[PDB]
Amino acid sequence: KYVKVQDFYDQLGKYVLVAPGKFSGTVAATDLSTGWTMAWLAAWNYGDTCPIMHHMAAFPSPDPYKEFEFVVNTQGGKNLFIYGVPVTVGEGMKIYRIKYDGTRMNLQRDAAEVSGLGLGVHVTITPEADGYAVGDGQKDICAEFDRETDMVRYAWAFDWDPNVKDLKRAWLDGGTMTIKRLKPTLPGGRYDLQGSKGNKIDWELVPGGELAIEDGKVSGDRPLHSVANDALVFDPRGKWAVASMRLPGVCVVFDRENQVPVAVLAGPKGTPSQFQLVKVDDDTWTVDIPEVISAGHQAGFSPDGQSFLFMNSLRQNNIMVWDSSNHDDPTTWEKKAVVESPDWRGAYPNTFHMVFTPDAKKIYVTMWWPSPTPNGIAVIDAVNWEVLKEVDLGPDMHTLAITYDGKFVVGTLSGYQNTASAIVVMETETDEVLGFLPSPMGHHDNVIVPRTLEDLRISRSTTT
C-alpha cells in the first residue's frame, strides 16, 4: 500500500557517494544502498575559517564500508563574495587528507602544511593510486603529490605574456605561455606557497569567467598574466598527465617520470591539433598562441585512454576530441571529432564536468547556466561523437560520477550556494532520471568510492 524507498536504493548496488559542500563547509559520504549518510565532517571544527570545501577525489579501497581515504581541498579569501550569499565576515587553499574508518571521518593532516604548497581547484588521484594532483587557477600551479609523504613529486607554474598588454585583448590577440619548473625554497624541501601565497588573482574565475578579468572586474597582482590552470588529469595508461589552462585555451601534456612537458593541445575549433612546445632552458618551456579563439575548461581521457577531450566554453561551446591511441608519443595526438549542438550556439550552456561509461561508448556531460534557465545533462555518443539527448534537471548542475558496473550516473546540483540542491540519479540503459535525494550542500564535486585501479578509469582521475 505504501511505497518503500529501500526498493529504490536496492537497485543501485553497494556503492559509497562522497561530496564536499563548498559554502556549506562540510564533506559527506552517503550509502547509496540504504540512503544513510555514513558520516560527515565540518572543517570549522578543526579551526578552518573559510571552510569552502571545494574539490575531492577518493583512493580505491577494496571495501569502502570498512575504510576509505580521500583528498579534499578548500578555497578562502575573497572566494566568499562571488555567489548569492550576503556574507558578513582564512586564505583557504588547504589540501586536507581524510580517512573514513568504518564509522567516522578522521582528519589526518593538511598536505599543503606538510608540502608547503596550497592549491585550490581540482583534486585528481593518480592512475597508480600512489598519489594525487591538484591545480589552482589563482596561482596557476599544478602538482602531483606522493600518497605516503604528502610531498610534491613535481610542480609546474604557468605564465601568460599577452601580445596586447590590456585585459580586453590579452587573450584574444594571443600571446606566449611559459611552462616553468617550480622548485621548493624552504628547509626539508618545502614550498612557501600556503594560502594566498602566489595568487595572481584574489578569487577563482567562475563560469562565464574570462570576460570578468577581460573587463577588469577581477582584482589581483598579475591578471594580465593569468592562464587560469584548472586540473592536472591522468592518462589511465600511465606516463602522462595533462594540465588544462582555461583562459588561453590549451592543455599541456606532461611526461610524469621525466618531469617534462611534451605536447600543447589547442582547444578551439579553427586551431591546429597542437601548438609548438619550445624548450628555453631545462626548467623552462614556452608556447606561442597567435590568437585565443575561446577559453576552455573541462578536460579528460576516455577510460581506455584512446580519446582525449577538452571543452571550449563561452565564445565556442563544444567538446574537442583528440586521437590519443599512440600511448607512445603525445606529439602525434591529432584532433578526430568535435561535439556541437544547435542548442550550444549561445554564450551558455557550458560543459564543465563529465564521466564515461566503462566501455567508452557513452559520456555524460553537465550543462551549466546562471539562474534561471534550468541546467541538465547531455548524453554523448562517444563512438560517433554525437549528442544523444539532453534532460533538464534544475539549478546549478555540477559533477557526475558513475557506479562502477556502469549502471547509474550520480550527479550533483548545488543551487548557486543559496537555492535548491540535490543529488540526481540517472540509469544508463535508457537514460531515464530515477529522481532526487536531499543534499544540503554546495557540491562542485562528487565521487563514488572506487574499489579497483580499473575503477579509477571513470573516477576523479582521468576526468573532472
- Of 330, 391, 400, 392, the C-alpha closest to 365 is 400
Nearer to its own copies, 337 or 413 (CB): 413
443 annotated as belonging to a binding site for a ligand: no
- Of 307, 295, 316, the C-alpha closest to 354 is 307
Distance CA 183, CA 188 (A): 12
For residue 32, the one-letter residue type is: L
396 annotated as belonging to a binding site for a ligand: yes
Angstrom distances, CA of residue 227 to CA of 80, 125, 158, 319: 22, 23, 7, 20
C-alpha cell at 140: 596557476
Site for Cu ion, rule CB under 5 A: 13, 224, 230, 327-328, 396, 398, 403, 405, 407, 444
DSSP, collapsed to helix, strand or coil, labels residue 222 as: coil
Q: Is 438 in the site for its own copies (CB under 8 A)?
A: yes
Phi, psi of 362 (to 5 degrees): -125, 145
Q: Is 399 in the site for its own copies (CB under 8 A)?
A: no
What is the total residue count of the chain?
464
Instruction: Answer whether 406's CB lies under 8 Å from 358's CB.
Output: yes
Nearer to its own copies, 126 or 428 (CB): 428
Q: Is 418 in the site for its own copies (CB under 8 A)?
A: yes
Q: Is 4 in the site for its own copies (CB under 8 A)?
A: yes
122 annotated as belonging to a binding site for a ligand: yes
CB of 430 to its own copies, least distance (A): 8
Where does residue 47 fall: left (phi above 0), alpha (psi -120 to 50 degrees), or beta otherwise?
Answer: left
Give the contacts of 4 (CB within 8 A, at least 6 positions apart): none
Residue ranges in 45-132 assigned as alpha helix (H): 111-115
224, interface contact from its own copies, Cu ion, none, CB < 5-8 Å by kind: Cu ion
Instruction: Find the binding residues for its own copies in span 91-150 (CB under 8 A).
Output: 103-107
55 annotated as belonging to a binding site for a ligand: yes
List the x/- string, 10-39, binding to its own copies by CB under 8 A: xx-----x---x-xxxx-x-x---xxxxxx
CB of 129 to its own copies, least distance (A): 26
Angstrom distances, CA of residue 170 to CA of 161, 210, 325, 356: 8, 10, 35, 35
34, interface contact from its own copies, Cu ion, none, CB < 5-8 Å by kind: its own copies
230, interface contact from Cu ion, its own copies, none, CB < 5-8 Å by kind: Cu ion
24, interface contact from Cu ion, its own copies, none, CB < 5-8 Å by kind: its own copies
CB of 27 to its own copies, least distance (A): 8
CB of 269 to its own copies, least distance (A): 37
For residue 130, the one-letter residue type is: D
- Give the rounded distance of the alpha carbon of 207 from its chain centre: 13
Stretch touching its own copies by CB under 8 A, among 6-14, 199-207, 334-342, 356-364: 6-14
2, interface contact from its own copies, Cu ion, none, CB < 5-8 Å by kind: its own copies
Where does residue 360 fall: left (phi above 0), alpha (psi -120 to 50 degrees), or beta otherwise?
Answer: left
The binding site for its own copies (CB under 8 A) comprises 1-11, 17, 21, 23-26, 28, 30, 34-40, 42, 44-47, 51, 80, 84-89, 103-107, 394, 415, 418-423, 425, 427, 429, 432-441
